[PDB]
């Protein structure tokens, strides 16, 4: 009552006010959007449309009032009440707000944008541009004046029910007013009991009514259907446009391509009769509009960004967007390759070449998609100013990120430039590639080096666009730092101040909510962690609905993401629900089982990997601190880490966690089996370590101390399976073969020339190199044979 009367106050009194008092009054008013009652919402909408119409021109402050009014209107273009949506659509669709010309409608919809309704603007624009197409003379008329043949096209009605298939097998009324209240020959409290009983039956009637209403609302069609034996082509244009706009408001992607088609067709029809000067000027206006759209958006919905860059693709004059903006949108929204063609054709049309910006953007996007061939195929050109970048990328093509990080660091720290200073974009490439390779270098030290507050002293560290790129890397660094058993509260304070500021907080939940969930688990804020994680998973599955089927790789990455999401949510789904302090439920004995579910081997790069193990170990730590069991959790993490190192060796990320392996050996003396398994892991890794310099490399470290002198308990004195025994025989024969081949290929190696313990052990295992290679080949044959007879014993 009071809110409604106050809005009516404002509505009646504001037509007699100064702009300054209006701007004073609107700030404590406009925020009443998202009020639980809708009626106040359309009341303020009436106020907003009034001032919108009254403010058109002058004073820049009244113009600011006008800007804020259209802003609150356009963000009001979504309401839960469909009637509000209908009335605002009717208001905006009028010729005054949006002029009836199609190109006028286009420029008007360009004039309006909001960063938050970027999900729905495509559908809204399609609805605006199609429902307006209703005053065309042929619009009620059928498309085809001819029928197929003679037939009776009687209408075929269609039913509708909440039930589905597979449910059943087989003042003239004064008599009423005169007889309404003849209470006199009745009792009062008996009538009271009747009234309250009737109230009770109405209560359970409401109960069953809401039980029925639990299901979806009844589906309504949008086109009358006639019936006949021959199809009736002669049907109105409404019959196809109305389902088209309906499904456009249903699905975003179909709205995407139909919007693209209508945009391309309308431009291809407008160009035929307008002067080239006006068409050109309109084209730059559009280009500015799209640049504004991409700069202002934050939640990069793949359909919207992809459709705007796609409609820019079809027109040569539209190949002039801010290419860095295009690159950022494509990488963030995972719509990369089409934007790659955008950059390519913009380069192609533009034809001294300053295209280094397009080059660097396409190169970083190709690095994002994973491949490396285009990178070198491009930077082998003279346009590549710094060949250090080319050398770094070709050398890390074998997943050698350490040297690439070294090259990036020395390049950014190379102040002198005899060949000319590199462009800012090239240095941005270098630092972002260093960030990505450090992300591959799963250790927290690389992450801290990322978080070393880069040059120019870089919420405080969020506003510039370079910082926007760093924020995911920065927070990933911070969480990997803290979750491993570290505490600084700097990240907590940062996200607390990031709550202040709607845009920063908004982007961090809409993209990175599981980070909030995990840190709230760190603070034991299980409720808000659950809220964040459910928000993340539902938003992400919505994105999976949004992404197209062609790009398998993005869907794969999303798949691994939601895999990690489900392990963390099932962890939070079992904390003390049954009560777990001394109740040794098999759940703990079951969650570790199946190798603590599938670790997703042989693919799924290392960031998935270390996230999985880090969260799992932090979990089991939380249980054991809130609950022989330690032996079980140690064995579990042992298995986790062995699967890790084996898979990452299969990943050929040969810059493995060396010191992690060293400490695995260091406290590998839990039982013999554990240290034995570590020994086989290390020796197999060194076996795979053979490379171009695998000759000198393998002869300098011949499985360190010759299989680490493992000749004490083979298969734990054969007490284990002889499959293990045949495994060590295989490894020993393998390293014998590698050394013998290395010596045969390089009889004059420096290491064998060098008088060292390697010389002693090689002559022991063997004078002349021929005798040594014959002896080592004999030993290799012997050990491989031993593995062979140990093999057949199943």
């Amino acid at each position: 009552e009071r809110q409604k009367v106050c809005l009516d106050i404002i509505y009646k009194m504001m037509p007699k006010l100064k702009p300054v008092e209006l701007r004073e009054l609107l700030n404590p008013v406009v925020e009443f959007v998202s009020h639980p009652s809708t009626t106040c919402r359309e009341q303020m909408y009436n106020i907003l449309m009034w001032i919108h119409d009254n403010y058109r021109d002058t004073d820049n402050d009244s113009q600011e009032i006008f800007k804020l009014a259209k802003d609150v209107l356009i963000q009001g273009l979504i309401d839960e009440n469909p009637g509000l949506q209908l009335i605002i659509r009717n208001f905006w669709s009028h010729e005054t707000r949006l002029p009836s010309n199609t190109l006028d409608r286009l420029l008007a919809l360009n004039s309006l944008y909001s960063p938050k309704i970027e999900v729905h603007f495509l559908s809204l624009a399609t609805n605006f541009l199609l429902e307006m197409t209703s005053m065309s003379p042929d619009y009620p008329n059928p498309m085809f004046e001819h029928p197929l043949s003679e037939c009776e096209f009687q209408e075929y009605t269609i039913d509708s029910d909440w039930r589905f298939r597979s449910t059943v097998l087989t003042g003239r009324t004064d008599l009423l007013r005169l007889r309404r209240r003849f209470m006199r020959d009745q009792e009062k409290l008996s009538l009271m009991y009747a009234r309250k009983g009737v109230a009770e039956q109405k209560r359970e009637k409401e109960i069953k009514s809401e039980l029925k209403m639990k299901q979806d609302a009844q589906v309504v069609l949008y086109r009358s259907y006639r019936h006949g034996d021959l199809p009736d082509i002669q049907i109105k244009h409404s019959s196809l446009i109305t389902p088209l706009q309906a499904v456009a408001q249903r699905d975003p992607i179909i709205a995407k391509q139909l919007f693209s088609s209508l945009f391309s067709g309308i431009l291809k029809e407008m160009d035929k009769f307008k002067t080239l000067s006006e068409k050109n000027n309109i084209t730059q206006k559009l280009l500015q509009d799209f640049n504004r759209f991409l700069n202002t958006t934050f939640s990069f919905f793949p359909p919207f960004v992809s459709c705007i860059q796609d409609i820019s693709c079809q027109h040569a004059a539209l190949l002039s967007l801010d290419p860095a903006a295009v690159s950022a949108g494509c990488l963030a929204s995972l719509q990369q390759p089409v934007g790659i063609r955008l950059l390519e054709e913009a380069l192609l049309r533009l034809l001294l070449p300053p295209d280094v910006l397009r080059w660097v953007e396409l190169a970083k996007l190709y690095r994002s998609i994973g491949e490396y061939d285009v990178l070198r195929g491009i930077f082998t050109s003279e346009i590549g100013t710094k060949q250090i970048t080319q050398s770094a990328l070709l050398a890390e093509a074998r997943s050698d990120y350490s040297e690439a990080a070294k090259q990036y660091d020395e390049a950014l720290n190379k102040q002198d430039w005899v060949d000319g200073e590199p462009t800012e974009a090239e240095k941005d490439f270098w630092e972002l590639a260093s960030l990505d390779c450090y992300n591959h270098l799963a250790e927290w030290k690389s992450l801290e080096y990322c978080s070393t507050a880069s040059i120019d002293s870089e919420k405080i560290w969020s506003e510039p666009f370079y910082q926007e790129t760093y924020l995911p890397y920065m927070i990933r660094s911070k969480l990997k730092l803290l979750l491993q058993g570290e505490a600084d509260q700097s990240l907590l304070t940062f996200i607390d101040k990031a709550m202040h500021g709607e845009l920063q907080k908004a982007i961090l939940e809409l993209h990175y909510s599981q980070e909030l969930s995990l840190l709230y688990l760190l603070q034991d804020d299980v409720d808000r962690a659950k809220y964040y994680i459910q928000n993340g998973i539902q938003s992400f599955m919505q994105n999976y609905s949004s992404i197209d089927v062609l790009l398998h790789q993005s869907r794969l990455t999303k798949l691994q993401s939601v895999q990690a999401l489900t392990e963390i949510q099932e962890f939070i789904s079992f904390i003390s629900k049954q009560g777990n302090l001394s109740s040794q439920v098999p759940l703990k004995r079951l969650l570790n089982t199946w190798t603590n579910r599938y670790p997703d081997a042989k693919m799924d790069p290392m960031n998935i990997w270390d996230d999985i193990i880090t969260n799992r170990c932090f979990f089991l730590s939380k249980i054991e601190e809130k609950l022989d069991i330690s032996s079980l959790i140690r064995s579990c993490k042992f298995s986790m880490k062995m699967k890790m190192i084996d898979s990452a060796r299969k990943q050929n990320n040969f810059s493995l966690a060396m010191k992690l392996l060293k400490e695995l050996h260091k406290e590998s003396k839990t039982r013999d089996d554990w240290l034995v398994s570590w020994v086989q892991s290390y020796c197999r890794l060194s076996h795979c370590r053979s490379r171009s310099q695998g000759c000198s490399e393998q002869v300098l470290t011949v499985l360190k101390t010759v299989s680490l002198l493992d000749e004490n308990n083979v298969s734990s004195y054969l007490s284990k399976n002889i499959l293990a025994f045949r495994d060590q025989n295989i490894l020993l024969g393998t390293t014998y073969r590698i050394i013998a081949n290395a010596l045969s290929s390089e009889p004059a190696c420096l290491a064998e020339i060098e008088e060292d313990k390697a010389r002693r052990i090689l002559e022991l295992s063997g004078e002349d190199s021929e005798k040594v290679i014959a002896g080592l080949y004999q030993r290799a044959f012997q050990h491989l044979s031993e593995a062979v007879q140990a093999a057949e014993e199943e």
Binding site: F144, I233, M541, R597, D604
Partner: protein
């Protein structure tokens, strides 16, 4: 239902989950724009092509949740198919005497019959 699906799907295993996805499974549905439609207007009228719509609306009305979306997409595709057959009967093209949407017929008849 959907949250259960996604959570347990993740719980299965990522490479195991990969089995949801080899002749590349898509190139195009036509070698040229065999079908087009001119949207009317009070002013001049541009031309739109249904071919880009055809496949994705086909699976969208084939199988999905949100029965409202299913019904709306079905109604749209029925209006679509009536319009395209009428256009084919209107002015036949060449190449096979009249292959208007012949390959497209080969694609649409299976989806029509299974829906």
């Amino acid at each position: 239902i959907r949250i259960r699906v996604v959570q347990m799907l993740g719980s299965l295993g990522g490479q195991i989950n990969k089995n949801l996805l080899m002749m590349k499974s898509y190139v195009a549905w036509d070698r040229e724009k065999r079908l087009s439609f001119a949207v009317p207007f009070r002013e001049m009228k541009p031309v739109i092509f249904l071919d880009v719509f055809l496949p994705r609306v086909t699976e969208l009305a084939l199988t999905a949740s949100d029965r409202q979306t299913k019904v709306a997409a079905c109604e749209l595709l029925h209006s679509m198919v009536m319009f395209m057959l009428g256009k084919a009967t209107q002015m036949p093209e060449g190449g096979q005497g009249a292959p208007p949407m012949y390959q497209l017929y080969k694609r649409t008849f299976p989806v029509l019959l299974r829906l």
